[PDB]
Structures are given as C-alpha cells and as structure tokens.
Amino acid sequence: ADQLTEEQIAEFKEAFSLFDKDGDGTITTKELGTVMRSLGQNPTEAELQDMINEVDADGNGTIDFPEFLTMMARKM
C-alpha cells in the first residue's frame, strides 16, 4: 500500500470517475466545485480555481488522476 490499501486507492479511482463525469480526461475548475461538493463540502468560486492550482503540477489549469493522487497524499 503506497497511499493506502487497494480499497482506498480503488475508491480514489471511483472518486475520479465521479469527478470527470464527462470522461474527458480532465477535471475542470467548475467540476472541482462538483468534486469538493460531492465529498460533502461547499467551495467558493475561488476555491475552484485555487484548489486546482494549488494541486496542479503542470500549471495547465486542469487536474488528472495522477495529480489527484498526489493531492490525495496531501489529504492527511
């Protein structure tokens, strides 16, 4: 288990699906709203822009699964 057991990791994969509902391979900022919100939270518009950028490794302005996982490492 790197991050966590295959369970938690697997769920992170599922969470990814929940994020990228379109399956475009790209979590958008607006989608981030949905994302954080879906986990049962309430982000501000700023939080969408900022939450992405804070965990954007490429500086592109989008989040993928790999980046999500690194973010997940921060989630602790």
- Site size with Ca ion, rule: CB under 5 A: 10
14: contact with Ca ion by CB under 5 A = no
Confirm or deny that 60 is annotated as ligand binding.
yes
Using CA atoms, how far apart are residues 1 and 53, in angstroms rounded to an integer?
A: 27
Q: Which stretch binds Ca ion (CB under 5 A): 8-16, 32-40, 42-50, 55-63?
A: 55-63
Binding site for Ca ion (CB under 5 A): 20, 22, 24, 26, 28, 31, 56, 58, 60, 62
